[PDB]
């Protein structure tokens, strides 16, 4: 008989899940498994993202329960847990969604050889990206494109991505009863308290496929907005209603299928002939994700500067004091500190807000390596993506893809063009809530009487600016021009 395991890592969803569909076909018993390391906090991960993952597992649990099955959260590492459960459960087939991350390749290749020795057939469909990214490289002559323009012409010749897979059946083959490793007390979904976190999450975005599909339908309530979407024209200061979809956490964990998103976009585009085109369109935003996945999965050392063949070797400063002030939202520039506060509280910021804080730390003002900034983003972002975080950090620091280092965002003027009254700043920096709008982006320029009346005295309640942007940005541009000349 056929007993199968569907192994969730990403792809935390029931819709468009070809690995789940294959596991369930002709199966007597199906074991939906997520493997959790109970000592992940011993040597990195904010409670905001880890609880987002836990909320995604609880949503999967309710979906399987509604279909007569159950999600098993196994504690341990995959190389030690799977050899046991293969024999105990009589497994004949192991299915999981393909993954191209570095550790994913080492981990999955080990699980492949263990299944082989146990007589278990392995099926690994592709469904986390729009396309088989290896097929895109092979169609391009054996190398990934290095520009978005060249990449978009490639996918146009390749054609549309595969349609989303059908829904799973209304009833699922359940796990066998009275299996010791499937005991409910040892396979439940933990809380953030039980895994060791002492501070509760503060983010307003809840995990799960249900929330992902709810947010998708909300975005498509106005097809005119979807059709005319232009990414560079969206408001980074909008927080009551963010200016973009905020689907990145759900796409990162696979709570939302990228192919379903793409299919829904095509349905709208065919009724709106004047819809926006790549790279600025909403479809173009998914192509950015596909582009960085295609380049990153084929480039060694993609997340580092050293050994990375696509990253410029820049002599970045080792300044812990600048990094600490940037990391702790005490730079003295309210626009920067407000966004860095949104990072630690929400775990998500608008794309152009990420631009501001990334440019400031690296090629704009402080000249600290983008790897240090990525380390800070990798801890707090609920949508942290190994390939996307790295690519955009190299972009913003002009180390890869982007080269126009004379374009420098002002930590004073940038946000003022969107939010002259500083509503975003008052929301995330309540110490400046009473400051008149004339000085909220430059609180040090406010006369002392105004600072006292507003209850925010620069130097006691809110720090002075750690740098002069005029001086600091001039020093950073001159240094980048010399680094660009020595790297020929
Ligand atoms: C320094 C820096 C680091 C970043 N780190 C990440 C990261 O770790 N994870 C992440 O998902 N995005 C990252 N991005 C990209 C971008 O900031 C987010 O994807 C976007 O803000 C998410 O909001 P949204 O879901 O509303 O995007 P939308 O505009 O609604 O776009 C929809 C989807 O397209 C994809 N997408 C959009 N913009 C980009 C982009 N620039 N690159 C790649 N894919 C994109 C995402 O999957 C996103 O969910 C980073 C940007 C910067 C400048
Ligand atoms: Cl600017």
SS (H, E, C) the chain: CCEEEEEECCCCCCCCCHHHHHHHCCCCEEEEEEEECCCCCCCCCCHHHHHHHHHHHHHHHHHHHCCCCCCEEEECCHHHHHHHHHHHHCCCEEEECCCCCHHHHHHHHHHHHHHHHHCCEEECCCCCCCCCHHHHHHHCCCCCCCCHHHHHHHHHHHCCCCCCCCCCCCCCCCCCCCCHHHCHHHCCCCCCCCCCCCCCCCCCCCCCHHHHHHHHHHHCCCHHHHHHCCHHHCCCCCCCCCCCCCCHHHHHHCCCCHHHHHHHHHHHHCCCCCCCCCCCCHHHHHHHHHHHHHHHHCCCCCCCCCCCCCCCCCCCECCHHHHHHHHCCCCCCHHHHHHHHHHHHHCCCCHHHHHHHHHHHHHHCCCECHHHHHHHHHHHCCCCCHHHHHHHHHHHCCCCCCCCCCCCCCCCCCHHHCCCCCHHHHHHCHHHCCCCCCCCCCHHHCCHHHHHHCCCCECCCECCCCCCHHHHHHHHHHHHHHHHHHCC
Report whether residue 358 contacts ligand 1, using a CB cutoff of 6 Å: yes
Q: Cα(459) to centroid of ligand 2, in Å?
A: 26
Nearest ligand 1 atom to the CA of 243 is 26
Nearest CA among 277, 287, 291 for reference residue 229: 277
* Cβ neighbours of 240 (radius 10 Å): 7
Q: Output the six-digit token pair for 428.
A: 């995330």
Regarding the beta carbon of 359 and ligand 1, being less than 6 Å apart is answered no
Q: Which ligand sits closest to the CA of 357? A: 1
HEC profile of 310-328: CCCCCCCECCHHHHHHHHC
Is the CB–ligand 1 distance for residue 396 below 6 Å? yes
Domains of the chain: 1-127 (3.40.50.620), 128-164+209-299 (1.25.40.80), 300-485 (1.10.579.10)
Cβ(172)–Cβ(70) below 8 Å: no
Find out whether the beta carbon of 235 lies less than 6 Å from any atom of ligand 1: no
Q: Please give the C-alpha separations between residue 140 and each of 98, 134, 290, 309, in angstroms, as whole numbers.
A: 21, 10, 15, 19
Method used for this model?
X-ray
Q: What is the resolution of this structure in A?
A: 2.0
CA of residue 21 to ligand 1 center, whole Å: 29
Give the span between the Cα atoms of 237 and 243, in whole angstroms. Answer: 9
Q: Do residues 461 and 431 make contact, with C-beta atoms less than 8 angstroms apart?
A: yes
Ligand 1 in reach of 293 Cβ (< 6 A): no
The residues facing 3 across adjacent strands are 29
């Amino acid at each position: 008989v056929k007993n199968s395991i569907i192994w969730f890592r990403k792809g935390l969803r029931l819709h468009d899940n070809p690995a789940l569909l294959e596991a369930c076909k002709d199966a007597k018993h199906v074991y939906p498994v997520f493997v959790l390391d109970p000592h992940f906090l011993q040597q990195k991960v904010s409670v905001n993202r880890y609880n987002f993952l836990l909320e995604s597992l609880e949503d999967l649990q309710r979906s399987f329960q509604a279909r007569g099955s159950r999600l098993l959260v196994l504690r341990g590492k995959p190389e030690e847990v799977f050899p046991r459960v293969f024999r105990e459960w009589g497994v004949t087939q192991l299915c999981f969604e393909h993954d191209t991350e570095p550790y994913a390749k080492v981990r999955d290749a080990a699980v492949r050889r263990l299944a082989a020795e146990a007589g278990v057939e392995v099926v690994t469909p592709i469904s986390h990206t729009l396309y088989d990214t290896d097929m895109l490289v092979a169609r391009n002559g054996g190398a990934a494109p290095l520009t978005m323009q060249s990449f978009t012409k490639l996918v146009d010749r390749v054609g549309d991505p595969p349609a989303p897979a059908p829904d799973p059946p209304a009833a699922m083959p359940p796990p066998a009863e009275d299996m010791p490793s499937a005991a409910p007390a040892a396979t439940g979904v933990p809380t953030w308290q039980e895994v060791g976190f002492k501070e509760p999450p503060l983010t307003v975005f809840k995990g799960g496929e249900t929330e992902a599909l709810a947010r998708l339908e909300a975005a498509f309530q106005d097809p005119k907005w979807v059709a005319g979407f232009q990414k560079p024209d969206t408001d980074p200061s909008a927080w009551e209603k963010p200016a973009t979809t905020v689907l990145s956490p759900y796409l990162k964990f696979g709570c939302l299928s990228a192919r379903l998103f793409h299919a829904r976009l095509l349905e709208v585009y065919r009724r709106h002939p004047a819809h926006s085109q790549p790279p600025v369109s909403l479809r173009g935003q998914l192509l950015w994700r596909e582009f960085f996945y295609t380049v990153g999965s084929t480039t060694p050392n993609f997340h580092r500067m050293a050994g990375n063949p696509v990253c410029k070797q820049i002599d970045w400063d080792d300044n812990p004091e600048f990094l600490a002030a940037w990391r702790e939202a005490r730079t003295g520039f309210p626009w920067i500190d407000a966004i860095m506060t949104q990072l630690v509280t929400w775990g998500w910021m608008h794309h152009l807000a990420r631009h501001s804080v990334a440019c400031f730390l690296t090629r704009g003002d402080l000249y600290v390596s983008w790897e240090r900034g990525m380390e800070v983003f990798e801890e707090h972002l609920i949508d942290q993506d190994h390939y996307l975080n790295a690519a955009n950090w190299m972009w913003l620091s002009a180390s890869a893809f982007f080269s126009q280092y004379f374009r420098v965002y002002s930590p004073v003027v940038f946000g003022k063009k969107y939010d002259p009254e500083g509503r975003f700043i008052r929301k995330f920096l309540p110490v400046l809530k009473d400051m008149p709008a004339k000085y909220i982006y430059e609180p040090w320029t406010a006369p002392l009487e105004v600072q006292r009346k507003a209850g925010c005295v620069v130097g006691r309640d809110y720090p002075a600016p750690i740098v002069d942007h005029a001086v600091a940005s001039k020093a950073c541009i001159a240094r980048m021009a010399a680094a660009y000349r020595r790297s020929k």
